Amino acid sequence: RLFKEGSDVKAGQQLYQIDPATYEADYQSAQANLASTQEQAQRYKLLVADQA
Amino acid sequence: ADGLAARGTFTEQLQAQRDLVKASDEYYQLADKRYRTGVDNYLTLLDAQRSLF
Numbered sequence: 651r652l653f654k655e656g657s658d659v660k661a662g663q664q665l666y667q668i669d670p671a672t673y674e675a676d677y678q679s680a681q682a683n684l685a686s687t688q689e690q691a692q693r694y695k696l697l698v699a700d701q702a
Numbered sequence: 703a704d705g706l707a708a709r710g711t712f713t714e715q716l717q718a719q720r721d722l723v724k725a726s727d728e729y730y731q732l733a734d735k736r737y738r739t740g741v742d743n744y745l746t747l748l749d750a751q752r753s754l755f
Contacts, residue, residue, distance in 0.1 A: 693739045702732045702739075 730754045 653665055733750040736742050 693741050696739050697736060697741065700735050702736045
């Protein structure tokens with residue numbers, strides 16, 4: 651609980667930490683899938699100019 | 703007459719062969735670009751290089 655009680659908080663200030671451990675995991679999996687298909691799209695972008 | 707027939711045919715047959723050679727060369731050049739961008743492996747570059755000569 652990372653706030654002193656009875657204080658004034660602003661918008662977007664973090665209040666708790668709910669120990670992600672699954673959201674981090676499928677974030678890693680989606681990050682790996684994006685880190686494949688980004689190069690897969692970039693090489694096709696370079697190739698499509700030469701009509702290969 | 704056979705010599706005149708060979709003269710009338712060979713200049714077009716060699717032109718067809720030259721067009722075939724340059725089509726294979728354009729194929730090899732596109733395959734080389736597709737290799738060096740990283741899309742394909744060296745084997746399907748080497749087979750096109752082989753078909754070229």
